[PDB]
Design a protein around this ligand. Structure first.
Ligand SMILES: CCCCCCCCCCCCCCCCCC(=O)OC[C@H](COP(=O)([O-])OCC(O)COP(=O)([O-])OC[C@@H](COC(=O)CCCCCCCCCCCCCCCCC)OC(=O)CCCCCCCCCCCCCCCCC)OC(=O)CCCCCCCCCCCCCCCCC
Ligand SMILES: CCCCCCCCCCCCCCCCCC(=O)OC[C@H](COP(=O)([O-])OCC(O)COP(=O)([O-])OC[C@@H](COC(=O)CCCCCCCCCCCCCCCCC)OC(=O)CCCCCCCCCCCCCCCCC)OC(=O)CCCCCCCCCCCCCCCCC
Ligand SMILES: CCCCCCCCCCCCCCCCCC(=O)OC[C@H](COP(=O)([O-])OCC(O)COP(=O)([O-])OC[C@@H](COC(=O)CCCCCCCCCCCCCCCCC)OC(=O)CCCCCCCCCCCCCCCCC)OC(=O)CCCCCCCCCCCCCCCCC
Ligand SMILES: CCCCCCCCCCCCCCCCCC(=O)OC[C@H](COP(=O)([O-])OCC(O)COP(=O)([O-])OC[C@@H](COC(=O)CCCCCCCCCCCCCCCCC)OC(=O)CCCCCCCCCCCCCCCCC)OC(=O)CCCCCCCCCCCCCCCCC
Ligand SMILES: CCCCCCCCCCCCCCCCCC(=O)OC[C@H](COP(=O)([O-])OCC(O)COP(=O)([O-])OC[C@@H](COC(=O)CCCCCCCCCCCCCCCCC)OC(=O)CCCCCCCCCCCCCCCCC)OC(=O)CCCCCCCCCCCCCCCCC
Ligand SMILES: C[C@@H]1CC[C@@]2(OC1)O[C@H]1C[C@H]3[C@@H]4CC=C5C[C@@H](OCCC(CO[C@H]6O[C@H](CO)[C@@H](O[C@H]7O[C@H](CO)[C@@H](O)[C@H](O)[C@H]7O)[C@H](O)[C@H]6O)CO[C@H]6O[C@H](CO)[C@@H](O[C@H]7O[C@H](CO)[C@@H](O)[C@H](O)[C@H]7O)[C@H](O)[C@H]6O)CC[C@]5(C)[C@H]4CC[C@]3(C)[C@H]1[C@@H]2C
Ligand SMILES: CCCCCCCCCCCCO[C@@H]1O[C@H](CO)[C@@H](O[C@H]2O[C@H](CO)[C@@H](O)[C@H](O)[C@H]2O)[C@H](O)[C@H]1O
Lengths: 57, 87, 383, 53, 106
C-alpha cells in the first residue's frame, strides 16, 4: 500500500524518457535506411545504331 | 484554474537530482516536475530547494482523435487490474 | 487460470482413464529414455558422461555447464525418432507434475484430498492425459499458455533490469541486439540482429551462474512445478535435460528438414514445446514456419557444425518474448476529456495556494520584477 | 516491356509503403494521447493512475 | 541487357496507389496545425520525418511507374548532389523527347 507504490511512482519518469528515446531511435533507423535507387536504362543511341546496321548502311 | 494536485515530486529539485535528464527543461532553464512539458515551472528555497509547477489555463493544438484500432490493445488477462480500479 | 467447477467435473470424470494413459506413456517413455541414456553413456564425451564439475568464481557453487554438461547427439536419429523425443518431453513435464502431487500425497497422508480438489479444478498442473477430447485439450493448452503469459514477463524484466543496471553493452551492434531482444511479440525480431546478445550475456552471465530467483521464474514460464524448489541444481537439471532433448530434436529436424514435411498440428506442437507459438494466437502455417526458421537461424550455423547452441539464458528470453504481449489499453480516447480531481473543487484554494497561483501564474514576471526591485531598494537603503 | 520488368519492385514497394503507413499511425495515436494527457496535467486534473493506464 | 523477367511476387495486401496516396494525404492533413517548419540544418520533427519517408516512397514508385512529375520528385527524392545531377539528366531527356516527337510529327 505504501512502499512499492512510491517506488513505482519514482520509476515512472526515467522509464518514460527512455521509451521515448527508444521510439525516436526506431524512427531514426527507419529514416536512415531509405535510399533512392536511381535506375539506369539502355541508351537509345545504341538502338538507333543497331537499326542503321540492320539497314545495311 | 482548479486546485487539483499534479505529478508528485517528493520534495525534490529536479535541476540537481540524479535523474534530472529525465525531466524536460523549459526556456527559462527550469526542469519540469514531471515528464510532461511545463512552461511555468519554478523553484522555491526553503531549508532545501524544491520544484513547483502551477497549473494554468493554456490552449494546446489538439490532434484529432485517432481510431481505436491503433491505440487499443486487448491483451487483458483475468489477473490484470487497472490502476484506476486499484485506486 | 482460475479454478472452476466445470474443469473439476471434467478432471474427476477422466481421472482413472487419465491415470491409465499416464502409466502407458510412462512405460513408453521409460523405453525411449533407456535407449537415449544408453546411447549417451556409450557415445557421449568423457566430460558429459563423467559429469565434469564447473564451479562459480565467487562462491564456488557447482552448476551445469552448457558446453560440457550438455551434449547434442547428432546420430540419435538411428535409434530414436523425432516423435519419440517429443513424446518423451511431454511425458517429462507430465511426470514432473504428477511426481510433485504424489509426493505431497505421501507426505500429508489423507489430508491432501481437499488440495487435490483444488488441483483438479484447474488444468494448470494436471497432465495432458486427463483430456480425452479436442475441446478439453484446447482448454488445457489455453491454461498452460495463460501460465506462460503470467510468468514470462517477470523473467524477462529480471534479466534486462539486472544487466542494464549493473552493466552496459560494449559496441553499437550489441546495443541494438540487446534493445531488440526484449521487444513485444507484436513486432518481428531479426535473429541475426539479436544473436550477439548471446555472446554479450555469456560475458555477463552464463547458464552456470544463473540465480535461483531467475531460475524459479524460468521454471514457472516453462510450466515446470517449483514447489518445493529446493536447491537451484534440481530444477536446473530439469531445464538442462529438457533443452538438451529439444536441441537433439532440432538438430534432427534441421538436418532432415522434417518441419517442411511436418503437418500443421504437429508443427504447432513442435513450436509450442519451444515456447514460440501460443495457441490463443490462432497462427497459420506461414507464421509457424517463419518463427521456426527464425529459431533455427538464432541457433546459428555453429549449432549444426558442432552442436553448440548460444547462451541458454538468452535463448530462453528470446523464445519467451513471444509471450510478452503488448501492455493492455482499453477505453475510448474520449475518456481523457474528463477530470480526476473534481471532488476537491469544493475545498477551493487557501492562502498559500492563492499566493502560489499569483506568483507563478501568468502575472509571474510582473510579480518577480516588483519583488526584485523592492528587495534591491531595501538593500540599498540598508547600506 | 519496361512495365513488366519494373513490376516486382513496384508491388513490394507498395506493400512496404502500406506497412510503413500502418507503422506510423500508432505513433501519431500515441502523440495525440500524450497531448491530451499534457492538457489535463496543465489543468491539475490528471491522476497518476490515469497516466499509467 | 537486362536478363530474365524477375520471379513473380504475390502481394500481401491489396491496395491501389491512388488509395495509398489519398490515405497519406489524410494522415498528413490532420497534423498540419501541429506541424512546424524549421531550418534545414535544425533537427526534424516526427511529422516531418513521416512526411519525407512517405513522399519519398510514393514518388519513387511514381517515377518507376512512369509519372515523371519533376516538380515533386526534385523535392521529395533529392537528398544527394548525385540526385540533383540525376534530376538534371532526366529533365533534359524528357524535354528532348518531347521536342523530337513534335518535330518528327511536324
Ligand atoms: C518431518 C521430517 C523432518 C526432516 C528433518 C531432517 C532435515 C530435512 C530433511 C530433508 C528435507 C528436504 C530438502 C533437503 C535439502 C535438499 C538440498 C538439495 O537440493 O540437494 C540437492 C542435491 C542434489 O544435487 P547434485 O548436483 O546431485 O549434488 C549436489 C552438488 O554436489 C552440489 O555441489 P556444490 O558445489 O554445492 O558442493 C558442495 C556441497 C557438497 O555436499 C553435497 O551436496 C553432498 C551431499 C551431502 C553430504 C553430507 C555428508 C557429509 C559428510 C558427513 C560426515 C559426518 C561424520 C561424523 C562422524 C561422527 C563420529 C562420532 O555442499 C556442501 O559442501 C555441504 C556439506 C554439508 C555440511 C554440513 C554442515 C553441518 C554443520 C552442523 C553444525 C552443528 C549442528 C548441531 C550440533 C550437532 C552435534 C552435537 O542433493 C544432494 O546432494 C543430497 C541431498 C540430501 C537431502 C537430505 C536428505 C534428508 C534425509 C533425512 C533422513 C532422516 C530423517 C529424520 C526424521 C526425524 C523425524 C521427523
Ligand atoms: C513409503 C515411504 C515414504 C517416505 C516419505 C516420503 C515423503 C514424500 C517425499 C517425496 C517422495 C517421492 C514422491 C514420488 C515421486 C515420484 C518418483 C520420482 O522420483 O519421480 C521422478 C522425478 C524425478 O525428477 P527429475 O527432476 O526429473 O530428476 C532428475 C534426475 O536427473 C533424473 O535422472 P535421469 O535424467 O537419469 O532420469 C531418470 C528417469 C528416467 O525414467 C523415466 O523417464 C520414466 C519415468 C520414471 C519416473 C516415473 C514417476 C511417476 C510419478 C507419478 C506416480 C503416480 C502418481 C499417482 C497419484 C494418484 C494416486 C491415486 O527416472 C526417474 O525418474 C528415476 C529417478 C530416481 C528414483 C527416485 C526414487 C527414489 C525413492 C524410491 C526408492 C526407495 C527405496 C527405500 C529403501 C528402504 C531401505 C530401508 O521425481 C520428481 O519429480 C522429484 C520429486 C518432486 C517432489 C519433491 C518433494 C520433496 C522431496 C524431499 C525428499 C527428502 C528425503 C525424504 C525425507 C523427507 C523429510 C521431509
Ligand atoms: C481426490 C483427488 C486426487 C487424489 C489426491 C492427489 C494429490 C492432491 C494433492 C496435491 C495437489 C497439488 C496442487 C495444488 C494446487 C492448488 C493449491 C492451492 O491451494 O491453490 C490456491 C487455491 C485456489 O487456487 P486457484 O483459485 O485455482 O488459483 C490458482 C492460481 O494459479 C494461483 O497460483 P499461485 O501460484 O499464485 O498460488 C500459490 C499460493 C498458494 O497459496 C494460496 O493461494 C493461499 C491459500 C490459502 C488462502 C486463505 C484465504 C482465506 C483465509 C480465511 C481465514 C478464516 C476466515 C474466517 C473463517 C470462519 C469459519 C467459521 O502461494 C503458495 O504457493 C505459497 C506456498 C506456501 C508454502 C508454505 C510452507 C510452510 C513451511 C514452514 C516452514 C518450515 C521450515 C523448515 C523447518 C525445519 C525444522 C526442523 O486456494 C483456495 O482454493 C482457497 C481455499 C480456502 C479454504 C478456506 C479457508 C481455510 C479453511 C481452513 C479450515 C480448517 C479446519 C480445521 C480447524 C481446526 C482448528 C483447531
Ligand atoms: C492478513 C493475514 C492473512 C492470514 C495469514 C495467515 C498467517 C501466516 C503467518 C506466517 C506466514 C509465513 C510463514 C513462513 C514459514 C517459513 C517458510 C519457509 O521457510 O519456507 C522455505 C521454503 C520456501 O518454499 P519454496 O519451495 O522455496 O517456494 C515457496 C513458494 O511459495 C513457491 O511458489 P511458486 O510460485 O514457485 O510455486 C507455486 C506453485 C507451484 O506449483 C507446484 O509446485 C505444483 C504443486 C505442488 C504441490 C505440493 C507438493 C509438495 C511435495 C512434498 C513437499 C515436502 C513435504 C515434506 C514432508 C511433510 C512435512 C509436513 O506451488 C503451489 O501452488 C503450492 C501450493 C501449496 C498450498 C498450501 C499452502 C499453505 C496453506 C495452508 C494449508 C495448511 C494449513 C495447516 C494449519 C491448519 C491445520 C488445521 O519452503 C520449502 O522449501 C517448502 C517445504 C515444504 C514442506 C511441507 C510443509 C511443511 C510445513 C508444515 C505442513 C503442515 C501440514 C498440515 C496439514 C493439516 C494437519 C491437520
Ligand atoms: C507454523 C510454524 C510451525 C513451526 C515451524 C518451525 C520453524 C523452525 C525454524 C528454524 C528453521 C531453519 C531452517 C530454514 C530453512 C529454509 C531456508 C530457506 O528457505 O532459505 C532460502 C535460501 C535462499 O536462497 P536464494 O537467496 O534464493 O539463493 C541463494 C543461493 O543461490 C542458493 O543456491 P543453492 O541452493 O545451490 O545453495 C544452497 C544449498 C547448496 O548446497 C547444496 O546444494 C548441497 C546440499 C547439501 C545437503 C546436505 C544435507 C545433510 C543432511 C545429513 C543427514 C544425515 C542423516 C541423519 C539421519 C539421522 C538423524 C536424523 O544448500 C542448502 O541450502 C542446503 C543446506 C542444508 C540443508 C539441511 C536440511 C534442512 C535443515 C532445516 C533445519 C535446520 C535447523 C532448524 C532449527 C534451528 C533454527 C535456528 O535458499 C535455500 O537455502 C534453498 C534450499 C532450501 C532447503 C531447506 C528447506 C527444505 C524444506 C524443508 C522440509 C522440511 C519441512 C519441515 C516443516 C516443519 C514444521 C514444524
Ligand atoms: C487442513 C484441513 C483439515 C480438515 C480437512 O481438510 C483439510 O481434512 C481433510 C481430510 C479428509 C478425510 C480424508 C480421508 C477420508 C477417508 C474416506 O474414506 C473413504 C471410504 C472408506 C475407505 O475407502 C472408509 O472405510 C475405511 O476403511 C479403512 C480401511 O481401508 C478402515 O480402517 C476404516 O475404519 C474405514 O472407515 C472418507 C472421507 C475422509 C474421512 C475425509 C473426510 C474429509 C476430511 C476430514 C477433510 C477436512 C475438510
Ligand atoms: C529405487 C531406485 C530406482 C532407480 C530408477 C532408475 C533405474 C535406471 C536403470 C538404468 C540401467 C541401465 O543399464 C546400464 O546401462 C549402462 C549404460 O548403457 C551399461 O553400461 C555399460 O556400457 C557403458 C558404456 O559403454 C560402460 O561405461 C559400462 O562400463 C558398461 O557396464 C550397464 O551395463 C547397464 O547395466
Amino acid at each position: 500500500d505504501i512502499m512499492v507504490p512510491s517506488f513505482v511512482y519514482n520509476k515512472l519518469p526515467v522509464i518514460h524518457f527512455l521509451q521515448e528515446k527508444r521510439a525516436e531511435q526506431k524512427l531514426r533507423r527507419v529514416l536512415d535506411e531509405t535510399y533512392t535507387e536511381w535506375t539506369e536504362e539502355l541508351d537509345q543511341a545504341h538502338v538507333t545504331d543497331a537499326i542503321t546496321r540492320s539497314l545495311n548502311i | 484554474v482548479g486546485n487539483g494536485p499534479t505529478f508528485s515530486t517528493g520534495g525534490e529539485c529536479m535541476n540537481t537530482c540524479d535523474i534530472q535528464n529525465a525531466f524536460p527543461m523549459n526556456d527559462r532553464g527550469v526542469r519540469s516536475s514531471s515528464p510532461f512539458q511545463e512552461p511555468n515551472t519554478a523553484i522555491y528555497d526553503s531549508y532545501l530547494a524544491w520544484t513547483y509547477f502551477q497549473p494554468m489555463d493554456v490552449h494546446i493544438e489538439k490532434l484529432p482523435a485517432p481510431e481505436a484500432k491503433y491505440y487499443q490493445r486487448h491483451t487483458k488477462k483475468p489477473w490484470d487490474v487497472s490502476s484506476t480500479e486499484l485506486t | 487460470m482460475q479454478g472452476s467447477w466445470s474443469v473439476l467435473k471434467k478432471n474427476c470424470s477422466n481421472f482413472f482413464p487419465g491415470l491409465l494413459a499416464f502409466a502407458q506413456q510412462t512405460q513408453e517413455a521409460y523405453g525411449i529414455w533407456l535407449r537415449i541414456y544408453n546411447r549417451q553413456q556409450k557415445y557421449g564425451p568423457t566430460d558429459f558422461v563423467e559429469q565434469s564439475e564447473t564451479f562459480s568464481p565467487d562462491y564456488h557453487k557447482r552448476f551445469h555447464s552448457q558446453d560440457k554438461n550438455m551434449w547434442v547427439d547428432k546420430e540419435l536419429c538411428t535409434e530414436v525418432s523425432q516423435k519419440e523425443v517429443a513424446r518423451l518431453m511431454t511425458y517429462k513435464l507430465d511426470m514432473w507434475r504428477m511426481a510433485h502431487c504424489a509426493g505431497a500425497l505421501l507426505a500429508t497422508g489423507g489430508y491432501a484430498i481437499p488440495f487435490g480438489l483444488f488441483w483438479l479444478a484447474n488444468d494448470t498442473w494436471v497432465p495432458s492425459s486427463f483430456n480425452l477430447t479436442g475441446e478439453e485439450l484446447r482448454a488445457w493448452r489455453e491454461a498452460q499458455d495463460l501460465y506462460r503469459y503470467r510468468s514470462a514477463p517477470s523473467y524477462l524484466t529480471d534479466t534486462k533490469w539486472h544487466f542494464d543496471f549493473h552493466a552496459y553493452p560494449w559496441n553499437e551492434t550489441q546495443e541494438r541486439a540487446w534493445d531488440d531482444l526484449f521487444e513485444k511479440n507484436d513486432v518481428r525480431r531479426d535473429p541475426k540482429v539479436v544473436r550477439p546478445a548471446a555472446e554479450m550475456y555469456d560475458g555477463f552471465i552464463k547458464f552456470e551462474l544463473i540465480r535461483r530467483k531467475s531460475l524459479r521464474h524460468l521454471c514457472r514460464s516453462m510450466n515446470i512445478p517449483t514447489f518445493p524448489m529446493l536447491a537451484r541444481l534440481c530444477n536446473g537439471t530439469r531445464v538442462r535435460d529438457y533443452w538438451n532433448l529439444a536441441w537433439c530434436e532440432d538438430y534432427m529436424v534441421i538436418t532432415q528438414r522434417l518441419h517442411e514435411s511436418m503437418t500443421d498440428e504437429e508443427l504447432y506442437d513442435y513450436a509450442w514445446r519451444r515456447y514460440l507459438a501460443p495457441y490463443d494466437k490462432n497462427l497459420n502455417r506461414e507464421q509457424l514456419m517463419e518463427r521456426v526458421e527464425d529459431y533455427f537461424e538464432f541457433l546459428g550455423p555453429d549449432f549444426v557444425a558442432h552442436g553448440k547452441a548460444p547462451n541458454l539464458v538468452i535463448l530462453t528470453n528470446y523464445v519467451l518474448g513471444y509471450y510478452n504481449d503488448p501492455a493492455y489499453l482499453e477505453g475510448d480516447i474520449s475518456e481523457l476529456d474528463k477530470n480526476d480531481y473534481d471532488h476537491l473543487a469544493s475545498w477551493g484554494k487557501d492562502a498559500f495556494l492563492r499566493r502560489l497561483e499569483f506568483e507563478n501564474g501568468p502575472l509571474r514576471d510582473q510579480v518577480e520584477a516588483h519583488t526584485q526591485r523592492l528587495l534591491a531598494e531595501r538593500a540599498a537603503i540598508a547600506k | 516491356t519496361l512495365q513488366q520488368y519494373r513490376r516486382a519492385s513496384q508491388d513490394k514497394r507498395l506493400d512496404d509503403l502500406v506497412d510503413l503507413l500502418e507503422r506510423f499511425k500508432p505513433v501519431l495515436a500515441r502523440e495525440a494521447i500524450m497531448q491530451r494527457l499534457t492538457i489535463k496535467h496543465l489543468e491539475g486534473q490528471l491522476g497518476v493512475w490515469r497516466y499509467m493506464d | 541487357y537486362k536478363g530474365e523477367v524477375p520471379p513473380h511476387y504475390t502481394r500481401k495486401s491489396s491496395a491501389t496507389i491512388e488509395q495509398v496516396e489519398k490515405e497519406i494525404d489524410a494522415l498528413l492533413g490532420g497534423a498540419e496545425k501541429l506541424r512546424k517548419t524549421s531550418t534545414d540544418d535544425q533537427p526534424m520533427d516526427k511529422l516531418t520525418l513521416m512526411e519525407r519517408c512517405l513522399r519519398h516512397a510514393l514518388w519513387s514508385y511514381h517515377k518507376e511507374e512512369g509519372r515523371y512529375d519533376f516538380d515533386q520528385i526534385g523535392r521529395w527524392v533529392v537528398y544527394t548532389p548525385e540526385d540533383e545531377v540525376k534530376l538534371a539528366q532526366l529533365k533534359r531527356e524528357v524535354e528532348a523527347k518531347e521536342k523530337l516527337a513534335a518535330l518528327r510529327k511536324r
